[PDB]
Design a protein around this nucleic acid. Structure first.
Lengths: 125, 35, 80, 135, 105, 50
RNA sequence: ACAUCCGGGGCGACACACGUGUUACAAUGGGAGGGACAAAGGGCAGCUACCGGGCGACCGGAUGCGAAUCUCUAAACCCUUCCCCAGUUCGGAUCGGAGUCUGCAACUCGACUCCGUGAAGCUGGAUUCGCUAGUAAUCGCGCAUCAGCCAUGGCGCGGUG
């Protein structure tokens, strides 16, 4: 069968379809090691499976859109955590202990008029 | 005028002898800032 | 510079005056305000008084001036 | 704020050190510098120890104890922060080819108990012991 | 040695050719490509044939060294003696490419 | 004349121009060793526009 | 004539002083080759699919789109390699040459492109300013005015953090 989930982080959106299998994580019709050629990014994406010892037990298909690499990896991690919670509701405390299921609401602040940036001000003198 | 003196020392007087009345005021400020 | 497809920019009235003087064979001074006009080979040997804002600076065109604008020889600002 | 475990060692102290090391938000560059420095450390002092153990011992060696605000005790978090900042700052000040090489040299020196960071710590200790009466 | 110029003997071709007056990075790359010498070869490693090819490409084009110096000096002298705006700006020592003074040199 | 004070190794050497096919032989103090040695405006206007 | 039309100048001059900024002084860097990820916003004489010419700015045919439909949009990042501490493969000011566009017209006084030249600058005293989390720092993208543009300014957007 299929388990559907969605994660969000900044401008990145991840839609994750999870199914029974062994190890195939396919992102945008690409392998995980080819889409994310960074050990840190791969670890971020595959964090909840390693925490719940559910690795080597599923196939995941991910559709990511928007943002950069870190935002996309965090969104994918959130989506995988939500899918795991949907599959088994008893792992919610374990995932909460690490915070994989909390939606981080931090976004880029709007630039304000009369200022070079959101908070940085001009040199008064 | 305005002394630099790290922190500002500004004064302004309006008269025909402003260049001296301002100096009197600034002398008062400098003495008060001495200690 | 100016695109080569458009050719050089030369004031038509000023050029007509210069060729009229060439055909006549006489010598005189041509008073002009066309500071942006390019100097052509037909301009060599004449005297052209170019306006600079408040007077007419006279220029005697030589062969090394061909291809330069007329305003490069009539400075507009006075400094001392 | 939350601190991510280090990808290689699973430590928060490593991530904090990289955060101190980072310029302009280039965390990948800072991580590469730190891992490289550990590599020269393990290739040079190859010592019946580990690569991260030497770094931890160096931080513990160059950490200070008391700080004159009159002397007073130091919180553990400020102690760790000042130790990391001192190590990085003197590594930057010292000469060398690459930042990884400079950091590895300073880590080795701090472990071997001599260096600019240790000199700074000893000077702070002397300035602290100078004012024992007002304490 | 090459055009009367001794190059850095331990540098690659595409950098060491820029030490000649009249050749930059782009001209060095183009010269090496037209002569058929790989640009990542040290000067000391150039064969006699390769040095001859480079010298012959430098000749027949690429006005360099004393010829370029004399040409530039002649151009500057002509510009100054024509008495144009740029000529007087060069004679007096002020910017002549539209830059505004009173704030910067 | 004074033996020893004068520089030694005054062998005969050949100077060869690599770009002029010129070979010379001398006794420069440096079977000859080989040393390789290397050795208007109107017209422009008419060309642009005419 | 302190009213009014026009052409040519000036508002762009420089002994210098002050303020606000942009680049740098490099190894946490600079080149060369390859791989990947945004959001907002604009578009009718405008953006242009796709071909052909030019090293390039651009030019010539042709297509779709008054547009969630057709077009304009990445760089920091990652991988391989060189430079190995130098006024250098750092820096890119100044000046010389040749061009492309806009416009009746680019001299004073435009933007961009291609060659060449390649300066001061080795992290800056007294002093002084900003900020407290998706913030500072750093990276690129877009818009207003607008024939063109001196836009490094103003107003916004997202990336890494």
């Amino acid at each position: 069968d299929y388990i559907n989930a969605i994660g969000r982080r900044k401008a990145a959106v991840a839609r994750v379809y999870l199914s029974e299998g062994s190890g195939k994580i396919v992102i945008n019709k690409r392998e995980i090691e080819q889409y994310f050629p960074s050990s840190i990014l791969q670890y971020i994406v595959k964090q909840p499976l390693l925490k719940l010892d559910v690795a080597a037990k599923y196939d995941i298909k991910i559709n990511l859109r928007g943002g950069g690499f870190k935002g996309q990896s965090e969104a994918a991690r959130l989506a995988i955590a939500r899918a795991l919670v949907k599959i088994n509701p008893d792992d919610k405390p374990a995932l909460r202990s690490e915070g994989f299921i909390t939606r981080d609401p931090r976004v880029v602040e709007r630039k304000k008029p009369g200022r070079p940036k959101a908070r940085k001000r001009f040199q008064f003198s | 005028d305005k002394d630099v003196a790290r922190a500002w020392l500004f004064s302004l007087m309006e008269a025909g002898q402003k260049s001296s009345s301002v100096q009197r005021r600034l002398s008062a400020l400098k003495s008060f800032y001495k200690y | 510079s100016r695109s080569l497809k458009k050719g050089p920019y030369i004031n038509l009235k000023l050029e007509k005056k210069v060729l009229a003087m060439n055909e006549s064979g006489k010598k005189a001074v041509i008073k002009t305000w066309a500071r942006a006009s390019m100097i052509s080979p037909d301009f060599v040997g004449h005297t052209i008084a170019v306006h600079n804002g408040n007077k007419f600076i006279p220029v005697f065109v030589t062969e090394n001036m061909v291809g330069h604008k007329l305003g490069e020889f009539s400075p507009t600002r006075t400094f001392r | 704020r939350q601190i991510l475990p280090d990808p290689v060692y699973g430590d928060v102290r490593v991530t904090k050190f990289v955060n101190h090391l980072m310029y302009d938000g280039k965390k990948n560059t800072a991580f590469s510098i730190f891992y490289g420095a550990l590599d020269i450390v393990k290739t040079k002092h190859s010592e019946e120890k580990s690569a991260l153990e030497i770094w931890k011992a160096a931080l513990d060696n160059i950490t200070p104890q008391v700080e004159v605000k009159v002397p007073t005790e130091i919180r553990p978090e400020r102690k760790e922060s000042i130790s990391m900042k001192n190590l990085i700052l003197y590594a930057r000040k010292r000469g060398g080819k690459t930042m990884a090489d400079k950091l590895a040299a300073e880590i080795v020196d701090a472990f071997n108990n001599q260096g600019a960071a240790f000199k700074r710590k000893e000077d702070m200790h002397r300035m602290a012991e100078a004012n024992r009466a007002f304490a | 040695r090459i055009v009367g110029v001794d190059l850095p003997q331990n540098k690659r071709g595409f950098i060491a050719l820029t030490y000649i007056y009249g050749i930059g990075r782009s001209s060095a790359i183009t010269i090496l490509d037209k002569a058929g010498v790989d640009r990542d070869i040290k000067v000391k490693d150039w064969s006699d044939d390769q040095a001859a090819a480079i010298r012959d490409v430098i000749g027949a084009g690429y006005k360099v060294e004393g010829d370029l110096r004399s040409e530039v000096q002649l151009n500057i002298k002509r510009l100054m003696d024509i008495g144009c705006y740029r000529g007087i700006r060069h004679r007096i020592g002020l910017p002549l490419r539209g830059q505004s003074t009173k704030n910067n040199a | 004349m004074k033996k020893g004070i004068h520089p030694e190794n005054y062998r005969p050497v050949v100077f060869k121009d690599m770009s002029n096919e010129d070979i010379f032989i001398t006794r420069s103090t440096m079977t000859y060793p080989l040393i390789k040695v290397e050795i208007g405006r109107v017209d422009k206007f008419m060309s642009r526009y005419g």
